[PDB]
Structure 1
Amino acid sequence: SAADVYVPDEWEVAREKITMSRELGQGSFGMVYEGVAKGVVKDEPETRVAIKTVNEAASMRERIEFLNEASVMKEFNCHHVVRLLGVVSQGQPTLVIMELMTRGDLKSYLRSLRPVLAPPSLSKMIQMAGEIADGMAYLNANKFVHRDLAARNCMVAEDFTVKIGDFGMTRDIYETDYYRKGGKGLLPVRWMSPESLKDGVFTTYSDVWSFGVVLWEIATLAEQPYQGLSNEQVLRFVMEGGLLDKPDNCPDMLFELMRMCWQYNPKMRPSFLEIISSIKEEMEPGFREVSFYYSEENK
């Protein structure tokens, strides 16, 4: 296996080029912040950024697995995936400078719409659907599965664009979205595919499955899936072929999309590129300019 060390490369940023403006809420490894960082964007003066830290009471090991996780993202460069701008390995605390997403996670954003004004339009939904499908399609292309795709792990950018959220950001308040299946590890059973539940495997296919539960979230303004059913009852229901009900006033198209995402046989569900294909005529023109879908890279 790989060692528990971190070799500083060209992502290393001089701490003196950073400033903390305020807290945003504790995260997996510690307090996350909002601030500014010089020399992070090319030809750009300053940049508003998110700064993830690691508690002082953390093991060098946890601290090492923090930079390792952030490094996986050193490879990504997709408009619909919250980007890593830099790293600060030298000193204390250990930082990770990310792209700032002023509007937070999609689940919070969505539920905040519950409380003249009308709910999200199909056009706006297709937008989020396509934008999310784009990030996942990009990641899967790079041979990467999410294992935890959900509204809570999607970010809403300043201009409302949705991107695949980076690691260690899930809000502590959604703790309920997890369950210790078989008294073992914490799993997001309400977003998991029938096969992942039964065989413990996660593939590109189980991501499309989750994608579908997310399309559901977007439409039900983020209702807990299988609300009536308890965690243990969900495992039976889903594994036996039970689906989620078409939410009220849910456009035919979206539930139609959902239905396909939930084909019991994983190979029968569409891949992320196909999902985009069936909804590309609904996507805004800019998507043509920033998406991985129309990008060179798609081969």
Structure 2
Amino acid sequence: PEMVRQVFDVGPRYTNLSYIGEGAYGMVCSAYDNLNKVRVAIKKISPFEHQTYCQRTLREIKILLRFRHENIIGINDIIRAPTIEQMKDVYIVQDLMETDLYKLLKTQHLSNDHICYFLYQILRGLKYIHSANVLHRDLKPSNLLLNTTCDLKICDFGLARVADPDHDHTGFLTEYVATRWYRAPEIMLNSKGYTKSIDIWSVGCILAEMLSNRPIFPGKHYLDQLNHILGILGSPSQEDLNCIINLKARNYLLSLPHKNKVPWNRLFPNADSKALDLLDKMLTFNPHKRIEVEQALAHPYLEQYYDPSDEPIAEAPFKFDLPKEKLKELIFEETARFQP
């Protein structure tokens, strides 16, 4: 098998490999697709030793194979051994994307037109995801891929879940949903992250980050995150507190000194006022008052792009959400369509 930086066993269809990046149990390379005569991205995944890894791998594969949308990364092919016994790794082949929003924001200032276009594409993809009754649950710049013409595709559904609002409530300081900086305040207070509003919060954080090239709520650790959120939004209203029945959560908030809201236009003096209005509606403390994806698409900031007839929804929503060996068998089965 061809080697990179580690076995990268993808031939003969895919050749001329170039290292792109790595992970805890995989590696990403670019490669030439000899059938389609174009270069592609290939992700090597080696999840079989660990149950949790098998879970995330199965979620990613099952969701992406079922979704078909311009703003969601597709799976073009899956490479693996012909038998379960011989299967040690799985390679997911995808469209080759020039960069991601994390990398881009490290060195590039976005024009207002780019911010608007990117946000439109994120929400368009998210509308489809939510219409399938699915929560992405880890939206952040590194999970937004971009090609050389700024087409944006949402990736990494390994942490996704089927929405379950009737079972969202939980206690204080227990939950661990999303990546820290993109995590909604309620995750720390009383939410398991089983409602669509969790994703809208993350999009708001991404919007803020596009406006300034710095994360808006840069918590230094899990417990610090709420400090940053409240430091900008200010103290929640009585009405918003009244919505939190859990006493540990409500009393924590009541114990804090009063904090004033910091106006968005002071944080972002160069920003389009319509962007800031939308930002405020996504970064609303009360998840019940928080703007929903279809409302966000219809906001004046996005008027140049908005067209509900060209913002498709899923044909077939997911209706509902085991040892690593069953999981391996399921991954083997889910990937069979691509054999030989």
TM range (shorter): 0.7 to 0.9
Equivalent position SS for 2:120? helix
Question: Residues 66 and 270 from structure 1, CA distance in 2 versus in 1: closer, same or farther, beyond 3 angstroms?
Answer: closer
Question: Residues 36 and 204 from structure 1, CA distance in 2 versus in 1: closer, same or farther, beyond 3 angstroms?
Answer: same
**Separation of aligned partners in 2, 1:76 and 1:215:** 24
Q: What amino acid does structure 1 have at the position aligned with 2:183?
A: M
TM-score normalised according to structure 1 size: 0.73
Aligned counterparts, 1:245-284, within 5 A: 246=264, 247-278=268-299, 279-283=301-305
Q: What amino acid does structure 1 have at the position aligned with 2:310?
A: Y
Question: Residues 25 and 164 from structure 1, CA distance in 2 versus in 1: closer, same or farther, beyond 3 angstroms?
Answer: same
The answer on whether the counterparts of 1:123 and 1:282 sit within 8 Å (CA) in structure 2 is: no
Which runs of no fewer than 5 residues in structure 2 stay unpaired? 1-9, 82-86, 159-171, 237-258, 316-340
**Shift of residue 208 of structure 1?**
0.9
Q: What amino acid does structure 1 have at the position aligned with 2:106?
A: R
Instruction: Tell me which structure has the larger Cα radius of gyration.
Output: 2
Q: Tell me which residue corresponds to 2:74.
A: 83
**Separation of aligned partners in 2, 1:244 and 1:194:** 17
Question: Residues 71 and 106 from structure 1, CA distance in 2 versus in 1: closer, same or farther, beyond 3 angstroms?
Answer: same
Q: Deviations over 1:193-230 (max 9, x none)?
A: 12222123212111111111110011012x13234876
Q: What amino acid does structure 2 have at the position aligned with 1:254?
A: A
Question: Residues 212 and 296 from structure 1, CA distance in 2 versus in 1: closer, same or farther, beyond 3 angstroms?
Answer: closer
**Separation of aligned partners in 2, 1:185 and 1:280:** 32
**Shift of residue 281 of structure 1?**
2.5
The answer on whether the counterparts of 1:189 and 1:197 sit within 8 Å (CA) in structure 2 is: no
Q: What amino acid does structure 2 have at the position aligned with 1:200?
A: S
Structure 1 range deviating more: 119-128 or 62-71: 62-71
Question: Residues 229 and 96 from structure 1, CA distance in 2 versus in 1: closer, same or farther, beyond 3 angstroms?
Answer: closer
Q: What amino acid does structure 2 have at the position aligned with 1:87?
A: I
Question: Residues 137 and 25 from structure 1, CA distance in 2 versus in 1: closer, same or farther, beyond 3 angstroms?
Answer: same
Equivalent position SS for 2:215? coil
**Separation of aligned partners in 1, 2:175 and 2:199:** 22
Aligned counterparts, 1:5-44, within 5 A: 15-38=11-34
**Separation of aligned partners in 1, 2:72 and 2:14:** 22
- Give me the CA root mean square deviation: 3.2
Equivalent position SS for 1:78? coil
**Structure 1 position 99 matched with structure 2 position 108:** no
Q: Tell me which residue corresponds to 1:135.
A: 125
Which runs of no fewer than 5 residues in structure 1 stay unpaired? 1-13, 40-44, 114-118, 169-180
Question: Residues 184 and 124 from structure 1, CA distance in 2 versus in 1: closer, same or farther, beyond 3 angstroms?
Answer: closer
Aligned length: 255
**Structure 1 position 214 matched with structure 2 position 210:** no
The answer on whether the counterparts of 1:22 and 1:33 sit within 8 Å (CA) in structure 2 is: yes
